[PDB]
Design a protein around this ligand. Sequence first.
Ligand SMILES: *[C@@H]1O[C@H](CO)[C@@H](O[C@@H]2O[C@H](CO)[C@@H](O)[C@H](O)[C@H]2NC(C)=O)[C@H](O)[C@H]1NC(C)=O
Ligand SMILES: *[C@@H]1O[C@H](CO)[C@@H](O)[C@H](O)[C@H]1NC(C)=O
Length: 225
Amino acid sequence: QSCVWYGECGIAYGDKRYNCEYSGPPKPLPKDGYDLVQELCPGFFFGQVSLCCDVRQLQTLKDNLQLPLQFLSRCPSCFYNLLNLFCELTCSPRQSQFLQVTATEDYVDPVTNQTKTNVKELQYYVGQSFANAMYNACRDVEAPSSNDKALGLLCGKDADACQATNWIEYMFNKDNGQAPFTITPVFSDFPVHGMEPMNNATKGCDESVDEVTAPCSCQDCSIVC
Ligand SMILES: *[C@@H]1O[C@H](CO)[C@@H](O[C@@H]2O[C@H](CO)[C@@H](O)[C@H](O)[C@H]2NC(C)=O)[C@H](O)[C@H]1NC(C)=O
Ligand SMILES: *[C@@H]1O[C@H](CO)[C@@H](O)[C@H](O)[C@H]1NC(C)=O
């Protein structure tokens, strides 16, 4: 297994950071991060918890997920696939199979003056079926106390223009003021020049995420009506 990054490096803009380039194997997560990994990415919470992310990155992921939560929290299945998209990107011990760094710049440690490397941009190979299922689970979610679709607030365009691939492209575009750096998505259910797209299992809005979480309401999910 191999990583493309590990830990945070320099400022991109505002309070947002690039991650540090790293091409070695994943590393067992410190125990002080177990609460975060359980909350955000429980699928990775087993064995040595060897990941391509550190505690800082998990904390940042939690902070960065606030706005999707703002609009999608009422449909746990919809939010769950979105979390997994970000969990795989952030932490997967097999990152190198589906991420390709495309731009870097040097990072200088202000005290030690040792040089590290900011990952400025990368390409993310995302399963076509994954992306379609993620959209499918979220497409009927209403903005809370409204009759408009939640995706019209997370897609950089009205819901009638929002589609699976342009939703993911928008969320990953730093021009949105939220994403710390741009990720360029490539959608395929098939390998591409040796890259194996991320095609994790997904949950529909008519399914329970787990034993303690119900399916989404009829209001947010036309299947259950
Ligand atoms: C993406 O899918 C993989 C494959 O199903 C998940 O990795 C498994 O996670 C389960 C649950 O903890 C473990 O029992 C397995 O041992 C894992 N399998 C392998 C081959 O790694 C992974 O959890 C999913 N990612 C996320 C973010 O949930
Ligand atoms: C998702 O796809 C299913 C068919 O697999 C369909 O019944 C449903 O209309 C779609 N939308 C939602 C919100 O689940």
